[PDB]
Each structure stands twice: as C-alpha cells, then as structure tokens.
Amino acid sequence: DIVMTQSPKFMSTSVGDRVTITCKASQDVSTAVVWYQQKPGQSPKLLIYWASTRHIGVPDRFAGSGSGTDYTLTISSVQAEDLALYYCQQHYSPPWTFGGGTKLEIK
Amino acid sequence: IRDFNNLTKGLCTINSWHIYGKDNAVRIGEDSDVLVTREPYVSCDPDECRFYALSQGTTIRGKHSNGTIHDRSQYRALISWPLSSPPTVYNSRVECIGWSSTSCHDGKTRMSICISGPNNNASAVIWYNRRPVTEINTWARNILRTQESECVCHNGVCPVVFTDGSATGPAETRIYYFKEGKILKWEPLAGTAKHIEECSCYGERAEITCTCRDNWQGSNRPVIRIDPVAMTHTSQYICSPVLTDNPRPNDPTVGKCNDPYPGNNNNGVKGFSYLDGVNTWLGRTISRASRSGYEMLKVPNALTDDKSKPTQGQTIVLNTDWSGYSGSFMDYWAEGECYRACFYVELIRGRPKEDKVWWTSNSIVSMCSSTEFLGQWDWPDGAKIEYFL
Amino acid sequence: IRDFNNLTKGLCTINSWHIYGKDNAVRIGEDSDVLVTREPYVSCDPDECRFYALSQGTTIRGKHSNGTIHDRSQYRALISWPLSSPPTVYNSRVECIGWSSTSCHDGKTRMSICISGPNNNASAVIWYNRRPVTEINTWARNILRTQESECVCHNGVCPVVFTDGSATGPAETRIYYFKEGKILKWEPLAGTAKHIEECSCYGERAEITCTCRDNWQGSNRPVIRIDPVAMTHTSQYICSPVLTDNPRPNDPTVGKCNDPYPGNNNNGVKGFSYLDGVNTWLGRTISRASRSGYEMLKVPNALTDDKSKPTQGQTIVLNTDWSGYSGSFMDYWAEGECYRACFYVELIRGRPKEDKVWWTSNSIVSMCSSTEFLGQWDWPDGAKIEYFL
Amino acid sequence: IRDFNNLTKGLCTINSWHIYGKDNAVRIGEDSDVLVTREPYVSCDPDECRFYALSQGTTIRGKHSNGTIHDRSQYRALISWPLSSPPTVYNSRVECIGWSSTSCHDGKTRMSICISGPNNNASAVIWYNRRPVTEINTWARNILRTQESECVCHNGVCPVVFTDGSATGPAETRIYYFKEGKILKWEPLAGTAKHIEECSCYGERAEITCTCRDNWQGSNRPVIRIDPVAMTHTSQYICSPVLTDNPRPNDPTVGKCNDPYPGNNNNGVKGFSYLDGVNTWLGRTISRASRSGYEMLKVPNALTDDKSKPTQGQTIVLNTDWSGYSGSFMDYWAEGECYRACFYVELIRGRPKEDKVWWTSNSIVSMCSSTEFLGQWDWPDGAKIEYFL
Numbered sequence A: 001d002i003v004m005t006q007s008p009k010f011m012s013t014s015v016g017d018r019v020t021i022t023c024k025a026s027q028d029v030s031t032a033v034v035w036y037q038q039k040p041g042q043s044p045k046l047l048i049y050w051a052s053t054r055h056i057g058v059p060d061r062f063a064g065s066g067s068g069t070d071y072t073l074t075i076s077s078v079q080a081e082d083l084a085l086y087y088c089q090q091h092y093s094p095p096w097t098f099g100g101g102t103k104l105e106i107k
Numbered sequence B, C, D: 001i002r003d004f005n006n007l008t009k010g011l012c013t014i015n016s017w018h019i020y021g022k023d024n025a026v027r028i029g030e031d032s033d034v035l036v037t038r039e040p041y042v043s044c045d046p047d048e049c050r051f052y053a054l055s056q057g058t059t060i061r062g063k064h065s066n067g068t069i070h071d072r073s074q075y076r077a078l079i080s081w082p083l084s085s086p087p088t089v090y091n092s093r094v095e096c097i098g099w100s101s102t103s104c105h106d107g108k109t110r111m112s113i114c115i116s117g118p119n120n121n122a123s124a125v126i127w128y129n130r131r132p133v134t135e136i137n138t139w140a141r142n143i144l145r146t147q148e149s150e151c152v153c154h155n156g157v158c159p160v161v162f163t164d165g166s167a168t169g170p171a172e173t174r175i176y177y178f179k180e181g182k183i184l185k186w187e188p189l190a191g192t193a194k195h196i197e198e199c200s201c202y203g204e205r206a207e208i209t210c211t212c213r214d215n216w217q218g219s220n221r222p223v224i225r226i227d228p229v230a231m232t233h234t235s236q237y238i239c240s241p242v243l244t245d246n247p248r249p250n251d252p253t254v255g256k257c258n259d260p261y262p263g264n265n266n267n268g269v270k271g272f273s274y275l276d277g278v279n280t281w282l283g284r285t286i287s288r289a290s291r292s293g294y295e296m297l298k299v300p301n302a303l304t305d306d307k308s309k310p311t312q313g314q315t316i317v318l319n320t321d322w323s324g325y326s327g328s329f330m331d332y333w334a335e336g337e338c339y340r341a342c343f344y345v346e347l348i349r350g351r352p353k354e355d356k357v358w359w360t361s362n363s364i365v366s367m368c369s370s371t372e373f374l375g376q377w378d379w380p381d382g383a384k385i386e387y388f389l
Ligand SMILES: *[C@@H]1O[C@H](CO)[C@@H](O[C@@H]2O[C@H](CO)[C@@H](O[C@@H]3O[C@H](CO)[C@@H](O)[C@H](O[C@H]4O[C@H](CO)[C@@H](O)[C@H](O)[C@@H]4O[C@H]4O[C@H](CO)[C@@H](O)[C@H](O)[C@@H]4O[C@H]4O[C@H](CO)[C@@H](O)[C@H](O)[C@@H]4O)[C@@H]3O)[C@H](O)[C@H]2NC(C)=O)[C@H](O)[C@H]1NC(C)=O
Pocket: B241, B242, B243, B248, B249, B250, B251, B286, B287, B288, B295, B297, B309, B310, B311, B312, B313, B314, B373, B374, B375, B376, B377, C120, C121
C-alpha cells in the first residue's frame, strides 16, 4: 500500500501570504496525487488531481506541484476562509491512501 | 490489388456506430495461450482486415508476463492475427521487431515500420513486402517513436510521423513520405502544435488527416493534415472545448485553436477524431482523470469553431469499465460510394490499477460508421482479475 | 462459383439417413482449448461445408465458462471451424459479433448477419463478403432475433426471417429479402401462424421453405414458404398430429392446420422438417417433456393431411442421451440430379439439467439423406460430466 | 520463381546490422507448447524466409525433454516454422528425419538433406520438392555430418559439404554438387585445411563461400570457396589474428593463413564470416572460453592479410548472456542492386551450464546488413531458468 505522509500537522500564516504543504509517499506515484480541503463541519472537496489540475471552480490561487514521491499544495493570498485541514491522496494504485491532514491556522 | 490506392471518396455520413470486431483476448487468456499485447491497432489489406498490437513475448498465464507494464524490452514484435481471434502463440504472424510501430498497405503490398534499440541508440527499420528495405537512425537519441496505428497511403505514398526527443520538452517530430519502402522525402513539424506524439490517421479526398497527443502541455489535440501529393503539411489544434486527451481539465466554453489548451501537464493518451465539418466525431475517455469508458460525440465543426459542443453521443464503454488507447482505421478497399469510418479501443488490464496480478495486457473492441441511427451497447473487456489468482 | 446460385433440383428420395459429421467438441474440451458454443448450424460454400455456432468467449475448462447459460452477452460471435473439428480457440474464424445469427452463401460469396445490443436497443448488421454493408435497428425493441441456421439464396436473393417483440405475445416477425447485402424488400408475417420464431430453411425447385417455432401458443410448427423471385410468402402450420416442437402434449389423431395445436404454453425449441409430399420427414425430440433424443420420422404428406402418421423411423440419438436445437442445411453446390437433404442436432450439456458443472455448451451431430435403407446408430455427445469436477 | 537462381549481385556495404527476426521461443515455452530444438538456421524461399532447427521430439515443458543435450537420437527432424514464431507443436512443418541437416532452395523448389542412423551406419537422404530422390551411405562410418545452415545454389547447382570420420583426427570431408536432387559430382577436400567441420555459406558474384570449424587443431577458421560452375573448390584459413572459433587462445598479432592457428584442441563451435575485402565482417563469441556473447567486427581484408585487426564493432549479445552456434543466410530473392547479408545466433539454454533444469534448448536472434550506421542493442534469449522449477 502506498503511504501518504504529511508533516507538519499544523501550519500557520497570515492573511494575504503563501503557505505550502508537504505530502510525500512511499514510492514513485507518478504525479497522481489528489488534494482535498475539508473545512470544519463540511464534506471534503476536490481541489486538485494529478498534483496540478485544479478542479471546477477552485481558484487560480491554489497551485499544484510535485513529482516522484514528493508533493506540495501551495495556497497564495491566504484568505480568512482558508482555515481547514488539507489532505493528500495517492491515486496511482489501489488502495488509495490518504495523508493524515494538515491544519492551516491563520496567524 | 495490382495497382496502388488513391483516396477518391470522402467519409460516409456518421450517424451512429455499429460493432465491427472485438477479440475477447483477456477472457480467452485465462485458459488458451494468448500473448500479452499492448498498443493495438487494426489495419486492412485489399483482402482482409486484421488486428495488430505490440507483443511482450510471453503468454498472459506464463511466468514471464510478470512486469509487461514495461513499454520497452528487446522481446516485443508487431504481430497480426485474424479479426476477432486472440493474438495467440499459434495464430499470430510476426511482422518486425521492436517497441513502436505503424503499418499500412499501399494498394500493392504492405509496409511495416518497427523501431528498436536502447532509448539513445534506437533505430527504425521500414519493412515493405515482408523484406527490410530502409533503416533510420535516431536524430535526437531520445526514444524514437512512430504512430501505434495504421499509416495511410495515396498513389504509392504513405506518410508516417515519427518523434524523437522528449515528451516533456520540445521534441523533434519529423513527417516522412515513403514510397515502395524508400525515403522519398521528409519534413520537420510545421504548423502550430507544440509537441506531437503518437498520431492516428485517416484518408478522404486525397488528404491524409491525423489526430495526435500533446504529451507536453496540452489537453487538446494537435491535428496534422498531409497532402500526400505535394508532400507537404500543417499542424494546428482542435478548436472545440470538448477536450479529448486524458487526464483532462473540465471542458471550457471556449477552447483554443492554435495553442495547447492548458490544465494538465506531461501526460496523455493516444486518441483519434474524424474531422469532417458538420459530420465530425470526437472520441474521448469518460473519465477526466483516468482511462475509463469511451464516448463518441458528434461536435459539428469541432476543428474550426472555438465554441463547439456535442449535438449527439454514443458510449462505447462504460466509465465503470476500463479503456485505453484509441486510433482509427478504415477499410480503404471496400465497395461503395464512401468510406465507412472506424476506430478501435484498447481495453487495458492488469497493473497499475488492478494491481493484484503482476501483468498488464488488453483487448480490442472496434466500431465502424452506420448511417442508420442504431441503438447502443457498451463493450467491456470482460475478465475477472480474480480468476487469475 | 463466379455466378449466383439457382435452386434447380428437388430433393432426393429420403429413405434413411447416413452420418455426415460429428465434432466431439465436449469430449475434446476436457483437454484441448475448445470454446463454449451454443446454437450451432452448418452451412456450405461452393468449396467447403463448415459448422457454425454462437461462441461465449471462454473455453469449456477456463473459469469464465461459469454461467454460459446466459443466452446474451456482449462476448458472443458467430464462428466457423472446419467440419468435425472442434470450435477451438485456434482454428475458429470469427464471422461477426452479437447473439443471434444466420448466414448463407449466394453463389458468389457469403452473407452473415449478426444481431447485437441490449434487448431494447439491439441491432442487426448484415455482413457480406466479410465486410459490413447494411445495418437494421429494432422495430419493436424486444430482443430482435433471426434464424440460428443457414439462410437460403436464389438468383442473388436470400430471404432471412427476423422477429422482434415477445415470445409470449404477438411479436412482430418480418421477412427480409437481401441481394448482395442490401435491403431489396421486406414483408410483415403474412399467413396463419400466430407467432414465428427462429426458423430453419431449405430450397428446392425455386422455393425456399422454412419450419419454425411457435413459442407463443403452439406445439405444432408454423411453416413459411417463400418465393425468392416474387419476393413474397405464406405461413401455415404442419397439419400432422405427430407434434415436433417440445415440450409437447400427447399426439392427437387429428392435428390442426391453420391454428396452433394447443397443450403447451410459452416454450419451444428450434427444429426442422423436410416437407415434400410422400417424401416428407419430420424431426422431433423423443421426450415429450425435455430435450432428450432425436427421431426422424417419415409421415407422408404431413404439411397437408390433418390425419397423418409415421410410416418409418430413424433414431438419431437415444432418449437416454440429450438433444437440443436442430436445423437444416444442404450442400447446394454438390454434383448430381437432386439435393441431398441434411440436418444437424445440437447436443446440450451442462446446466440446467446436469447442474454439477457451472457451464452449458454442446456438440454437433449431423446426418444427410441416403436413398439406400441403411442401418441406424444412435449418436451421443459422449462426455462424462464427472471428469470436469 | 519458375527458373533457377543465379548469384548475380555482390554483397551490399555492411556498415552496421539491424534486427531481422528473433523468436522468443524459450520465453514462450514456459507456457505454450514449444519443441525443444537445437541447431537453428534460417533459409529463404523466393516467397518467404523461415527459421529451421533440429527438433528433439518433445516440448520444453514435457517430461521427455529431460536429456535433450544428446545430439543424436532417432527422434529429431529438420522442422521449419514462420519467421519469429516459436517452433511449436502446431505450426512447425517437418522437412525430413535425422540429426544433421542442410537445406536450400534452387530457384525452382527446395532441397533438404537429412542424415540419420547409428554413428557407423548413418545415411543421408537428399529430399527435393518434398519427395526423397537420393540417398548417400557413409564413406568412413563415423558420424556422417553436413552443414547445419542454408546451403547455396547457382544455376540449378547447390554445393553441400559433408564430413565423416573423426573430429579429433583426420576425417574425410567431401563436397557434393547436387542439381535437382541427383549427384552431379563430388570432390574430396582440396586445399590447406586440416579438418573441416560444419560450414555456413553464402553466395556473391557466382561464387559460393563457406566459413567452417576446425574442430581438430584450429582456433582459426578453414574457409572453402566453391565455383558452382566449374564444380571445383579450395580450402584455406582466415589470415586475421582476430580468432573467431571458441574456445580460443588470446589473439596473436600475426595469425596464420595456411595452417591451424594453435592453442586450443578438439573443440569448436559453428560460426560464419563475410569475406569481401575492405568490407569484411567476422562474427565470434565475446568469451574466449565459452559460448557467451556475440560480436561482429569489421576486420578489413581478414581472409588475406595475416596482420589484420578490427576497424569497427557491434555487439549482438552481451558476454553476460549466452550465445551458441551461428551461421549465415541471405534473402537471395530480394529486390535491389546487392545482397543484404545476414546471420543468426543460437541462444543456448539449459544444461550443461544452467544445469538446474534437465533440458537444453535455444532461441534464434537474427540480424541483416544496414548500410546506414545504426545504433546497437544487445539481444538476450531472455528466460529465467528459475521459472521452470
Ligand atoms: C437507445 O440507443 C440510442 C442510440 O445509441 C440512445 O440515444 C443516444 O443516447 C445518448 C445518451 O442519452 C445520447 O448522448 C447525449 O447526447 C447529447 C445531445 O443532446 C450530448 O450532449 C451528451 O453528451 C454529454 O453527456 C455525457 C454523459 O451522459 C458526458 O459524459 C459527455 O461528456 C457529454 O457531457 C459533457 O459535455 C459538455 C462539455 O463537457 C457539457 O455540456 C456537459 O456538461 C458534460 O460535461 C462533463 O463531462 C465531460 C466528460 O464526461 C467532462 O470533460 C466535463 O468537464 C464535465 O465533467 C450525450 O452524448 C445520444 O445523443 C443519443 N443518440 C441518439 C441518436 O439518440 C437512446 O437514448 C437509447 N434508448 C433506449 C431506450 O435505450
């Protein structure tokens, strides 16, 4: 099984900044990384698949990046509404393994 | 036929798609000796049509099928077998050795081109009438590659597109014009596409048209039109927002004609399209993200209008089954007023997605144009990955 | 033969039946790679006769044969293989895809018709000279179906009967006349039969005759005579009390000519008959209740006299062995003064009756008319359901 | 072709070697029914080229393959199968029985010669147009032997060399000239070679040339040039210090033309060479000591200059894979100005070196002359001796 590893487990930036969030995995998953965002008391939603393709209606300000084992979601212009847990998820082989989430606190 | 072919008809009115041929190769391969193939195509002779594909020198059930996911090995040939029979160890004919091919018949006999070697000392040999006649070394020493489907001839001239260089960069694609096996001429990629990979082609009214892969930065499709007589050509993109490559972004309301519609990076899948105005049909996977399902959609004037949408569909295979490569072919020698347009769909099985088995192979499924509006079925490879365990 | 055929002879005197060909497909399928078939037929070319049947895309012994009892799947083709060889993965040629067929040769080349799809969006494609040439959508969206045996041609014209609608109701049967693949004409069922299902046919003296299935309310048999030239036809029933469908009631002393002889409901089995006056022969199962045994009985004037009885028999297969479908065929191209009349018998095996194995497949057995009165043997499929466990 | 062949062209410029055909016979034989062969050759017809080899009457995986290391048995035939298919039980054609062969086509049809029997009552039968026409008894009752590769014809005349006597002694080699199957003439070995064993041949400009085995006392190679018209011949050695037999001593700076270059005793391996002046190429194993790897080296003027060295190479197969026999063949009937020169390499597997399996069989690998300087790949048999355990 592939193992999506996330660290840190909490992250904070102020309003208007950039933040970057590290998701890595066991072996080369060939960019097939998905990003979700789950805001407190809400379903997750699909941000990004193939580590870079923004899903319908997620804004330009969420950028996808990665390769091999190593992936990073970057948010820019950190709005007040961006506090949530971000989750990565492998989609190269079954079973689809998710990272453990990362809290984004806005400083 | 003792005289070379001319493309003298145009396409017939494509109003639905009937079934032409489906080998059940993987269902039959849990118990006959079928070879592990990948990259299929189907190409006709004046006297028969036959499926083709790259072999991996091992049967589905034998021990050496473990790892057939590797694209390139010195154990792969271009093999043919009769329509809807399996590529089996005993009915399969070998055409030429190596890991990327393209073959087509010139009216008189057939040409077949095989590419071989290491990634930086790879080499093409153009066979014609089952004898080797020309060889081509790499011009850029990075995995020299050609069509993976039927090439098309007019008056003794068959254009082949090749690409050598990277599927991430700028790569150096180069169109050749063979006649009877020899290099008549060749040309560097002219026109607007960024990168050209792996085309599938067709012919109507003395024009050879090709739909291809922008594996570099495109989710839309570079298309190459070749004049077999002038031995000349352009490239451009399909204007329609209905994107056919895969992985894909969502479909825009307004796609782009002359540059890669962006969203996905360094990834593609081989695919086709019939571009004939009001009578245009675009095939694409149902999945945005992976090779699942196959849909055929009428999108009138897709190549030109940058705001075109489907006016009709047809599901070749459900999103809950698997798809893969797709390319076109036509029975050029087939009595009538026009050309019955056809395509195949590679059904891929095994790894990386169904990883419980250590192999990867596939099935052909194949349809041709019916002018009547026929009802639709959807066409699964059909095997249960659990009986091979 | 470079010129279309004409039916210019009449039947030869049928005085006994010799063996023509029996594949031992199921006996050979416990150890070679035979495909699971069902619905066989046998049809000749000017140059060879070959068995046909619908495949189920899997071998007897492979794991996907489990459940081949399902009539319809997108994994069945019409396949041919040489006389008395098994339909094996490696010698079997595919003719066209789908679950109900009918094929015949017009003197020049052969036509083959395959029906496909879901029950309410099924579609027929008429192949001719191994190229598709016509397609037909459903006219009533309920399991569009055609002969399951050899169709017959005269002067370029080959009648096919089709049925779409239910085998419980009124259904809409429709006779087509193709020539070279195109729809020449077609006709709705004219004459006295209630429902027409699944015919088998033959030709003598410029007349194509057909014996069929009244799956609705008949234990006697609707018979269709077609004039290939006038492109016209009638339906009626076999008058004789000797009932040939199965399941069956006991035989009356006086059957009925113009309506379904009643007793059994919504059930049948495909079967044939040679209707030629004093020289008439009716095949039927020995079992009243199920597909066991096959008997051929001389019943002189069976089609007309409503009080006709056997004057002679011949057991093709014992009641303590299994039978199944049956249809007719003739070597139209075969030197002589008259037509040697022939038939096949599907030997069905597996489920639902021999349910210890999870599959259902069969054997052909086949006989042709001998004018001498030859001794008789009875001809078992032959396999032991216990060696597959 | 209805008229006998003439050798009217010379060799083409050999600047690199492309791939012509490789069956993956041993990789496919862990799961299809492939026969255990050894001693392959490849010879063309006007209409097709096909691989040949001696069979051992058993499949790789069946129990009787245990001990196929024994050269001679009354269970071996000369069999052919299409290019790059495996010699499989079902596609393999038998040519004639016995344990040493040589076959070639005379323009009109083909001859095939098989030798058979015990070592001291062995016998050759020359088949021609698949009928036996001449027989030859032993002239020295010690394992009468002929080429193990394509023999070559000119104007109806095909020289064959045979040897009977020991591969340790003086043995009695004898050149025959057949025409249409009959003994036209024959000659005792004339010229400077000590012992002649097992030649491989070729033809250019009305000359049939042969490179052979000095199994007696030579690590260099006796070469026989035959004038098919005069029906006459000489023997000599390859002058070049690059030694091609194997096992081998190190290469001298100055080899010897007219006597066996010494170092190794009673051992050899079948091998070839194209001797054409500046355009000469010598194939040899990479291993000094055993059958590993295969290299092709340009050694200009090798037959004559006693101080010649490589000016260019090409590795056919790495030293860390296995090689074996090698002989030459050419598509004599192949359109062009010159002769595309070709060779095969027997990939041997099993015992005695990979002794974990009880059998010994092999693969063909085969290349032909490219005038362009193509990149190189190396071509492994490919099977894992561990999946047969
Ligand atoms: C008997 O058989 C007949 C004949 O076979 C049946 O008729 C055919 O049935 C088809 C299904 O109804 C029908 O197809 C549809 O035709 C319309 C034209 O009015 C066409 O627009 C439809 O195309 C969309 O639909 C499929 C899903 O059902 C999509 O997967 C496909 O992409 C098309 O949708 C996308 O296209 C546009 C741009 O993407 C958007 O407008 C649309 O929102 C959608 O976007 C999403 O999907 C994309 C990929 O899935 C993705 O990239 C994007 O980001 C979005 O996620 C469809 O073709 C045939 O027209 C009809 N033909 C005929 C002659 O009748 C009949 O119903 C059967 N009857 C019975 C009793 O069985």
